[PDB]
Amino acid sequence: PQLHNGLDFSAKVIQGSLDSLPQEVRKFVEGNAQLCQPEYIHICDGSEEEYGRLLAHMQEEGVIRKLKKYDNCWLALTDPRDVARIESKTVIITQEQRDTVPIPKSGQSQLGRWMSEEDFEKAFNARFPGCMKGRTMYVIPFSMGPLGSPLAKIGIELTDSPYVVASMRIMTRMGTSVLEALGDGEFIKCLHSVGCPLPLKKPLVNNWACNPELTLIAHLPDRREIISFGSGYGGNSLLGKKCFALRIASRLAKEEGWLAEHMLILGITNPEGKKKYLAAAFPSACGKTNLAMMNPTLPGWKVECVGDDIAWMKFDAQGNLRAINPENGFFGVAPGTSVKTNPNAIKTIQKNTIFTNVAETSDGGVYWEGIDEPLAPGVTITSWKNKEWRPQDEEPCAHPNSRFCTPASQCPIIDPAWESPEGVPIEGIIFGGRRPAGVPLVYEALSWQHGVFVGAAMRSEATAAAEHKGKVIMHDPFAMRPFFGYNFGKYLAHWLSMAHRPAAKLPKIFHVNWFRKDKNGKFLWPGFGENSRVLEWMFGRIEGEDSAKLTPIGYVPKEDALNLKGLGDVNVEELFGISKEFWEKEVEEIDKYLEDQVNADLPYEIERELRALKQRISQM
Ligand SMILES: Nc1nc2c(ncn2[C@@H]2O[C@H](COP(=O)(O)OP(=O)(O)OP(=O)(O)O)[C@@H](O)[C@H]2O)c(=O)[nH]1
Ligand SMILES: O=C([O-])C(=O)[O-]
Ligand SMILES: [Mn+2]
Ligand SMILES: [Mn+2]
Ligand SMILES: [Mn+2]
């Protein structure tokens, strides 16, 4: 078959067999093995023995530390230059720029970053040749969604990072069973490399292999390929999460007629024994995980978690909107997680959990800002910078974007249908972000078209999940600005087209704001478990209760319609105040934004909602 058998990497396989791979899987592995030149090839089987041996190797290489206070928990400290997503180095490659991003009017699009195929080939050939020299190439077969489910998509990731392999075992369904379900079927090609071939040219920091200078995360939807280079952080290296399940999946969803969204899925049950499922799209570090597994304060209410970050939704033959969580774990923000803000997350991360860039205590535990737990006498803290850290210092002991990686099955309130292949019926959709002023606590959209407009007009404060710093209010429509896989105008038209489906049970659409502050800078709403009071009103509105009052921005709860028992100290006037002067500026910014960023691809119905809202505000 060959003149020198130079394309036969079978001699470098330390686990598995190239003869046991499907045809297109073997070509994908051997092809990039020839390009990246790894010393070994490791075909993952997903077993606990492999996971155990993998952790031991990382512990011997100094990559991770063991947390002896907990059961099978591990800490990783990364290079300070590789701590979050880099939107400016995240690109999408299509033949036409207009397929990826709308051509702006004034210029420079904020709805994505497009790179031509010619430029990407130059960038690709300047990075990957010989990039895995002296390292092991791990072959990761993983399924997004329940295995064997016809509504699940299978991926193959190639990486030279054992930290990525362990995290993908938690975040996805990984192992040999995925290759058997795959067969000769298609798969998304995922190629990742830390970009530090051996011997090292540059000195390594915190044993974290990364190349910040050449960092690039590329998406090729026409070729169904994800190519990421130079970063170890989960958002850039766990390719089945943001890269596949959002960016690549959103384009596939548009083509096939479903939805891939940056949304949590929760099930809520009332004291009358009636349960409904809701979805909520909040921007990064805006409260999805806390809401998806909150501890309700109202007696007789129970909330169960289906997912906390990614939802795949599709209308069924009965007209219901069915959603699944394609993930297998929680990659949640660590700081702020305490027993009072998220006790269900505390119970989950007790075991089998990988932490990244959180502080370690001398007794083998974890620590971060907002953990709200005093330490015993004698217990010292080592910060995420691997330095002696004291409470009276300026630098935080944990990075603001530090994460835990925990299995979703360990969550105490995990929904008993979170792995159901048919999905859960969604009866409501929630938008919202961080607005310190103007936006009331909750309101309801007037129609489906107005609801789609509400998602498109979302604005929020910047967080630590990306590279955007400061307290500046940015646009983040549908909480998908960093994750749009294709033209946002076409994305809006795809959402609007759902109203044209036969017998489609369109969910109700709400908008919330947990973060409205007073004149002194403190929150008007306590939030966290108290958000069950807001969910109670949405539940009643879905049942058709006459609890709404019409406003120029939509329906708000009537007077005494919210349950405020126990919270008599809440100022309801400023919390639901709708100022005409504030909303005249708001429609001005939304108009200038949509006209510039969406331009000729703006659906008329979204334009009509903007015009109708501006008219209702002018009549105040
Ligand atoms: N004031 C207030 N802050 C909250 C509330 N819920 C969460 N937060 C804060 O917001 C931060 C973000 O929490 P998460 O739920 O992990 O954010 P997320 O929406 O899941 O973001 P990603 O996981 O990156 O997609 C937390 O550290 C909390 O401190 C709330 O109800 N009220
Ligand atoms: O990491 C995340 O989940 C994000 O950035 O939304
Ligand atoms: Mn997210
Ligand atoms: Mn989250
Ligand atoms: Mn229409």
3-state secondary structure (DSSP) of residue 210 = coil
Active site residues: 286
Residue 419: count of CB within 10 angstroms of its CB: 18
3-state secondary structure (DSSP) of residue 288 = helix
The amino acid occupying position 216 is: L
Instruction: Work out the angle at residue 304's Cα, subtended by the Cα atoms of residues 167 and 482, and round it to the nearest 5 degrees.
Output: 50
Nearest C-alpha neighbor of 152 from the set 122, 127, 186, 121: 186
The secondary structure of 374-398 as a DSSP string is: PPPTT--EE-TTSSEE-TTSSS-SS
Q: How far apart are CA 424 and CA 391, in angstroms?
A: 45
Ligand 2 atom having least distance to the Cα of 284: 6
500 CA distance to ligand 5 middle (Å): 7
Ligand 2 atom having least distance to the Cα of 85: 5
Q: Does the CA dihedral 172-177-179-181 come out positive or negative?
A: negative
Q: Are 338 and 371 in contact (CB under 8 A)?
A: yes
Q: How far apart are CA 400 and CA 320, in angstroms?
A: 39
Nearest C-alpha neighbor of 478 from the set 433, 428, 412, 421: 433
Whether residue 269 sits in one domain with residue 239:
no
What token pair was written down for 577? 């105040």
Task: Specify the residue for token string 């597994």.
Answer: 293
Residue 131 included in any domain? yes
Phi, psi of 293 (to 5 degrees): -135, 40
Q: How far apart are CA 305 and CA 308, in angstroms?
A: 7
Q: How far apart are CA 423 and CA 145, in angstroms?
A: 10
Q: Are 239 and 190 in contact (CB under 8 A)?
A: yes
Q: Which of 396, 412, 428 is the last residue of a domain?
A: 412
284 CA distance to ligand 3 middle (Å): 5
Residue 573 marked as a ligand binder: no
What token pair was written down for 159? 């990486």
Residue 122 marked as a ligand binder: no
3-state secondary structure (DSSP) of residue 56 = helix
Method: X-ray
Pairing of strands 264-269, 442-444: unpaired
**235 Cβ below 6 A of ligand 2:** yes
**309 Cβ below 6 A of ligand 2:** yes
Whether residue 503 sits in one domain with residue 438:
yes
Q: Which of 412, 434, 460 is the last residue of a domain?
A: 412
Q: Are 596 and 559 in contact (CB under 8 A)?
A: no
Task: Specify the residue for token string 């310190």.
Answer: 436
Residue 3 included in any domain? no
Q: Which of 357, 388, 412 is the last residue of a domain?
A: 412
Residue 521 marked as a ligand binder: no
Mutate to test the pocket of ligand 1, among 286, 310, 441, 514 (most ligand atoms within 8 A of CB): 286
**Listed residues: CB within 5 A of ion ligand 4:** 288-289, 308-309, 332
477 CA distance to ligand 5 middle (Å): 19
C-alpha separations of 1 from 4, 7, 16, 22, 29 in Å: 9, 10, 22, 18, 18
Ligand 1 atom having least distance to the Cα of 337: 27
Phi, psi of 597 (to 5 degrees): -80, -35
Ligand 1 pocket, residues with Cβ under 6 angstroms: 282, 284-290, 308-309, 332-333, 335-336, 465, 514-515, 523, 527-528, 531
Residue 505 included in any domain? yes
Q: Which residues contact 425 (CB under 8 A, 6 or more apart)?
A: 277, 320, 321, 322, 323, 505
Q: How far apart are CA 91 and CA 99, in angstroms?
A: 13
Q: How far apart are CA 41 and CA 159, in angstroms?
A: 10
CATH, residue 180: 3.40.449.10
Whether residue 212 sits in one domain with residue 268:
no
Nearest CA to ligand 2 atom 2: 284
Nearest CA to ligand 1 atom 18: 285
Residue 189 included in any domain? yes
Phi, psi of 92 (to 5 degrees): -130, 130
Residue 234 marked as a ligand binder: yes
Burial bucket for residue 546 (CB in 10 Å: 0-12, 13-18, 19+): exposed
Q: How far apart are CA 230 and CA 150, in angstroms?
A: 34
3-state secondary structure (DSSP) of residue 255 = helix
- Side by side, the strands of the sheet bearing 403-407 are 64-67, 73-76, 354-356, 403-407, 329-333
Whether residue 397 sits in one domain with residue 339:
yes
What token pair was written down for 425? 């019926």
Q: How far apart are CA 431 and CA 3, in angstroms?
A: 60
Whether residue 125 sits in one domain with residue 74:
no
Whether residue 277 sits in one domain with residue 128:
no
Instruction: Work out the angle at residue 589's Cα, subtended by the Cα atoms of residues 584 and 591, and round it to the nearest 5 degrees.
Output: 95
**85 Cβ below 6 A of ligand 2:** yes
Residue 156: count of CB within 10 angstroms of its CB: 24
Q: Is 183 left (phi over 0), alpha (psi -120 to 50) or beta?
A: left
Residue 402 included in any domain? yes
Residue 394 included in any domain? yes
Whether residue 339 sits in one domain with residue 435:
no
Whether residue 311 sits in one domain with residue 387:
no
Residue 85 marked as a ligand binder: yes
Whether residue 372 sits in one domain with residue 304:
no
CATH, residue 580: 3.90.228.20
Residue 1 included in any domain? no
262 CA distance to ligand 3 middle (Å): 6
Q: How far apart are CA 552 and CA 578, in angstroms?
A: 9
Pairing of strands 366-367, 359-361: antiparallel
The amino acid occupying position 155 is: G
236 CA distance to ligand 5 middle (Å): 37
Q: Are 402 and 518 in contact (CB under 8 A)?
A: no
Q: How far apart are CA 85 and CA 618, in angstroms?
A: 41
Tell me which DSSP letter residue 244 carries. I
Q: How far apart are CA 228 and CA 92, in angstroms?
A: 11
The total number of structural domains in the chain stands at 3
Q: Which residues contact 113 (CB under 8 A, 6 or more apart)?
A: 87, 88, 90, 91, 92, 101
Burial bucket for residue 318 (CB in 10 Å: 0-12, 13-18, 19+): exposed
Phi, psi of 220 (to 5 degrees): -130, 80
Residue 510 marked as a ligand binder: no
Alpha helical stretches, state H, 307-447 = 343-348
What token pair was written down for 255? 């083509």
Mutate to test the pocket of ligand 1, among 171, 331, 333, 575 (most ligand atoms within 8 A of CB): 333
Tell me which DSSP letter residue 336 carries. T
3-state secondary structure (DSSP) of residue 169 = helix
Whether residue 273 sits in one domain with residue 371:
no
Whether residue 193 sits in one domain with residue 302:
no
What token pair was written down for 303? 């909330």
What token pair was written down for 162? 């054992």
Q: What range does the domain containing 573 cover?
A: 258-327+413-620
Q: How far apart are CA 173 and CA 406, in angstroms?
A: 13
3-state secondary structure (DSSP) of residue 192 = strand
Q: How far apart are CA 261 and CA 200, in angstroms?
A: 40
Resolution to one decimal, Å: 2.0
Nearest C-alpha neighbor of 232 from the set 210, 203, 213, 200: 210
142 CA distance to ligand 3 middle (Å): 20
Using CA atoms in the order 126, 127, 129, 131, what is the torsion angle rounded to 10 degrees? 150
What token pair was written down for 149? 């489910």
403 CA distance to ligand 2 middle (Å): 10
Nearest CA to ligand 2 atom 4: 284
Phi, psi of 252 (to 5 degrees): -60, -40
**465 Cβ below 6 A of ligand 2:** yes
Phi, psi of 216 (to 5 degrees): -160, 130
3-state secondary structure (DSSP) of residue 147 = coil
Q: How far apart are CA 119 and CA 330, in angstroms?
A: 35
Nearest C-alpha neighbor of 420 from the set 319, 307, 303, 507: 307
Pairing of strands 225-229, 188-193: parallel
Task: Specify the residue for token string 């070509």.
Answer: 27
The secondary structure of 534-551 as a DSSP string is: HHHHHHHHHHT-S-EEEE
Q: How many residues does the chain have?
A: 620
Pairing of strands 259-261, 311-315: antiparallel
Q: How far apart are CA 53 and CA 71, in angstroms?
A: 16
Q: How far apart are CA 115 and CA 83, in angstroms?
A: 24
3-state secondary structure (DSSP) of residue 229 = strand
Helix, strand, coil percentages in the chain from 3-state DSSP, rounded to 5 = 30, 25, 45
Residue 233 marked as a ligand binder: yes
Whether residue 486 sits in one domain with residue 609:
yes
Task: Specify the residue for token string 């108009």.
Answer: 591
Q: How far apart are CA 484 and CA 527, in angstroms?
A: 29
Residue 4 included in any domain? no
Mutate to test the pocket of ligand 1, among 238, 289, 330 (most ligand atoms within 8 A of CB): 289
Q: Are 571 and 519 in contact (CB under 8 A)?
A: no
